[PDB]
Symmetry: C4
Subunit: 389 residues, 4 copies
């Protein structure tokens, strides 16, 4: 086996409903299954397999450990995975390491697993390469050291990963780690609009550039947009200029007055958002997703723009389709690529959280849309889960 | 690994009971298992493995999602599989894709998975090659685009698949797709009697010809019989002439007056029926199954004719044995071949549906009969399932 | 991979308790497991793996299908397996074929699976090679065609298998099938004392000879002893002369008066008995097992003799150790060999049946003893199962 | 594949929390899982996999077999394993052999499994190489022959194992076994302070030397410290001189007056302790763990000293971090090494026993800490298990 590189995307001009992983369709009291209580799912693929990752509360449904599953950080939280297609139950899952913030990616040769745990003021990112724990990175702003919640990205053996640290309501200057065979070989300090960046969804724009659509939880409903040149190891961040603001909450499309760099209103709070590249010979496609509600984590719409510069383009993103109706939960979303024999398949995954408050269990299904064929997006996704059962 | 081709069948002059997959033997309230609620099972084999496929309602027994399991189409329906031999439970199964109509086949190098989902009036057939979503095909008659419910058929890398679209009670003109490494490279418009063809059970008559025994749900109890030439990529459909009408419902054997092409009576309604080839040096054997009841989906009998032309032969099919008695349910049936070291084993599988109406769960077992040795077919298959438990 | 052959046995002079497979330790109502209800377990090893085989009633514990589990023949009975070491549950097991009498063996390249089902008066032996059903053999005495209930024996690709047919209370003249790559290539008609022979436990004495210790269910408590020359394909049978009669029921040791060939008393009824070879350079060891009780299926003792001729030697077998106490069930026993890097390890497995009558479930654990090291057999095996739970 | 050897340890100056295996998070009555009841867990790694071993009472939670799970020795006890990461349930686990004292290790080519069973006064150690039972060793002091409860240690094909035998309250003179491909090829009689040594946690100090930190259950709270030279096959035992006494129970640090060899007080009783090597070019790190309580099996601290001689060094061990708080159970602890591509990762595993006395179930979680990165140990480990559920 050799190092993997991003290839030209497979043919197609539209996404379609691919797969639903809804493990709590089997968590009824009347049932005999043990789906794990999880959140922050993401997917990462290598040359033969895709892995469905999530962070678990180390508790199952049905079970006696529902209390505390709405929180994110605790000493029980672990990064888990199944082969994509398998239901993430107790027995099907594999536990990688203790983590309440994760990431993972395959470099052509081996899996890299990323897991942050530790106290709020001094958290720790841990790196696992296959079975071995290989490196760590330390909290630098002493306020919840955090990572992508989606796949990291490997090229020629070098895997790039966004980390962040800082107040959820204030400054969180992200950084990028260059990781090779489980070990950090460079720290990359981005320049530009670095005020607040977290939960970057990153992918390859080419063999030269990794691009991320990120979350600003404090200041803007515009997504910070990272451009990382992997040849010079330099990163730059500016807000997406598009009137189609991708964060939730958000104000009305186009209502933020001023040039591209204006913040301005409804900026506090946020959501991780899906983003994936369609690489063609002389054209680049950028696919994004955002909730159907402006304020709530309800529904999910898929958007697209071809070519241009996301930093300077005020033009609206074209609405491609409704992946999750307004009646269904649409929480975190993420991008990932499936590796076909000769080309790469861009896909958007959606976390669809089962939320009934703190007095009951709190977990998530995963819906997957992929680029396939031509036409328009045809069907939405439902979890089918009644939380009373 | 290289492309696969049909071969001479293994020696044998009779089918025998091979294996029952009855997952609901373990779905009691008093038990601790989670057999999936499924229907439309089928089996497809490659050079080392046979996968048992089905369409699931994403629901288990015991469980609290029985309502809507008598229906076929919904947003939750998925194409699943296990290694043949394994019980298709929640954990054992793998979820390939959302689909309420399915098919799959191995081409010698990789699995092609087929799955139709979407709305009634604009459904979508989706193709997966291994892990990658690779192609789609669109609804052409806008009335439930549908596919085989059994294995597609690959030769030298080219996999042929029957798709149909149109009214269940009127016109459904089927088409064939030629699929290579997950992408459609040719549409094949059949000629002849094309009024209504669905749920074709296809198989290789030789390296030149694919033949299918299909379902007319509207006009006839004779099965439409496809002959696809894979070298010229041309298909032709005519009704089976035999007096031994294979559909359910059906009138008495030989009661349809007129020449081969006559419809005539008890044609509305239908059932997918099993069909497999026994290829010998200078002789062909065609094996078929039909319900033991003329009107109801009860029982399953195995029939055989050697040589001749199914389009013009009015001779009765030889009754070979009773695979499922009149007291046991006999729903869909399908053909498949197991790959032995140097030769191919023809098999008929039978969906035995557990039907207690819409007020309880609705699922199936799968009975398997294969060509083996000489003599006569000796034993029938029962599910052993009590639906009150 | 190449054909396998019997090798010199691994060093050792005593058997010891190796492993207990007791699945119903997890079948409590208070539990969350699904151990399968089985009987007639046996084990067969290839160059890398040992598979634990049994015949299941297609039912679990806890479950609602206990009625009929004391019977042996029914339309639900299947041959199952797990990797030795795994608990045979619903999900862990693989179902090979319908069978109420079984056998299996590895030839160096692939598994041969053997399964008899069908009606009493016309039963059918079915052969599976890997995934393909390959051959059948027909009932020749029309009264429960039957087979070993233990591993068959392969050499140079030729697998030898005992089959029998005939009354349980009168004549059952056994035959041997030579099977190659799933297909029968010779029938071997044994000569000699052929009155009644069933459930042969067979093993290699050398590269030239297969020897079996069998059950006479009608006439004698002496075990018929087969000697099959695999080079000339000839088989001979005579009763074991030893005063240590191995069948249950049986009279007192040495109480049968007359020369080697005398029957005489308590001959009706019987049990399958364990038998395995310890092959040394200039010496052979024969290991056998028999119940501790003379009349009941309670207890299991291990016995040994070196060299000599089992047909003419009246000398008592040396008692080696008590594998199962009088207080524990001791039902069927069998021989098998584990494949070490350069040598073979002889082992005796014991079926320990949980018998509460017909009004409850009826299944079995498996105890394994193997040759290992020097000294004397040290510890007995209990199932630890309380049938009320 | 070729024989494995200890290598330079991976870069790192601190241990961090790596992974919790807490199978009883799933054993609620309201739950649908079957975690095995186990104790004495330990981990051993080969070049591609780590296996998490334990000794089971052949019982699950929930279950009806809780009575007797506080004891150690019985006829049901077995050595089991899962891939490290997987929850050790009835279905996930594999049963290696009957054993109420265990060990295991990988030699670069195959797994060696060690398991002691038998009666108190004549126990038997059993060796399994892959699937084959290969050798045994006999009781020499006739009072509970016993082994490591942690991984044995292989170099160039030779695997070294500590065995002991004798009163738990008096003399237990340990021996070492040199095991090659599952067969004992040398007995090694240690010299020196040999009064009482058991449950050695062993590791490679270098390619020349294996060092062990052991338990004296009778005379001292100092750990007997073995140094085995693998080239000459000689062993020597002396008590650890450090004032930081590692056993539990124990008096205050440095309260044992006298030279290094002095016993003196609170010596009766004890606990197996963790111990692993950090091998660097011209420096050795020795990592140890002891309970946080002096008297009770509560908490677990990690300690470290670099260089020097454990036999003569009276200096306090540096407190590195608190892996398990005083409020959480801290029972047996053990050392193991994970194999990275070019170096070895030292790790400490901690058995966290759920103890509610003999009137309920008795089992354990496993906490893992590994060397990763720089700084200081950051977070403790809780089981999260409520034993009423
Ligand atoms: C990226 O680089 C590799 C070789 O370095 C090449 O094979 C591949 O086609 C390139 N990817 C794109 C998108 O051009
Ligand atoms: C089909 O063709 C392949 C080569 O093209 C050949 O090996 C095979 O035997 C042929 N099949 C039949 C049924 O003759
Ligand atoms: C049996 O035959 C093969 C060669 O045919 C040989 O390698 C093996 O050692 C022989 N077995 C015995 C028991 O001598
Ligand atoms: C131990 O020995 C082997 C070769 O004998 C060598 O490859 C390895 O690096 C040595 N280990 C250490 C720790 O020096
Ligand atoms: Ca925001
Ligand atoms: Ca019809
Ligand atoms: Ca008898
Ligand atoms: Ca002590
Ligand atoms: Y959060
Ligand atoms: Y339908
Ligand atoms: Y019987
Ligand atoms: Y103990
Ligand atoms: Y399971």
């Amino acid at each position: 086996p050799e190092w993997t590189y991003p290839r030209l995307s497979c043919p197609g001009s539209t996404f379609q409903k691919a797969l639903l992983i809804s493990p709590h369709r089997f968590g009824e009291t009347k049932g005999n299954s043990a789906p794990l209580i999880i959140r922050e799912p993401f997917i990462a693929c290598g040359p033969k397999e895709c892995k469905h990752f999530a962070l678990t509360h180390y508790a199952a449904q049905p079970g006696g450990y529902y209390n505390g599953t709405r929180g994110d950080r605790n000493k029980l939280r672990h990064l888990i995975s199944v082969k994509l297609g398998k239901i993430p139950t107790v027995e099907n899952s594999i536990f990688h390491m203790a983590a309440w913030s994760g990431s993972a990616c395959h470099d052509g040769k081996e899996w890299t697993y990323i897991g942050v745990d530790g106290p709020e003021n001094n958290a720790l990112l841990k790196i696992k390469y296959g079975e071995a724990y290989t490196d760590t990175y330390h909290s630098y702003a002493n306020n919840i050291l955090r990572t992508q919640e989606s796949a990291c990205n490997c090229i020629g053996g070098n895997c790039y990963l966004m980390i962040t640290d800082g107040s959820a309501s204030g400054i969180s200057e992200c950084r990028f780690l260059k990781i090779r065979e489980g070990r950090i070989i460079k720290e990359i300090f981005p320049t530009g609009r670095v005020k607040h960046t977290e939960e970057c969804t990153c992918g390859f724009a080419s063999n030269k550039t990794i691009e991320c659509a990120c979350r600003d939880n404090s200041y803007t409903a515009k997504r910070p947009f990272v451009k990382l040149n992997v040849e010079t190891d330099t990163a730059e961040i500016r807000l997406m200029c598009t009137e189609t603001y991708l964060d939730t909450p958000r104000p009305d499309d186009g209502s933020i007055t001023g040039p591209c760099e204006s913040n301005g209103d409804k900026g506090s709070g946020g959501i991780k958002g899906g983003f994936v590249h369609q690489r063609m010979a002389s054209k680049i496609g950028r696919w994004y997703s955002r909730t159907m509600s402006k304020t709530k984590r309800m529904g999910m719409g898929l958007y697209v723009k071809y070519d241009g510069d996301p930093w300077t383009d005020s033009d609206a993103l074209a609405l491609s389709g409704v992946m999750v109706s307004m009646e269904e939960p649409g929480w975190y979303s993420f991008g990932f690529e499936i590796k076909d024999k000769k080309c790469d398949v861009p896909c958007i995954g959606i976390e669809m959280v089962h939320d009934g408050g703190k007095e009951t269990w709190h977990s998530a299904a995963t819906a997957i849309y992929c680029l396939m064929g031509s036409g328009q997006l045809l069907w939405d996704t439902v979890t089918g889960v009644d939380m009373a059962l």
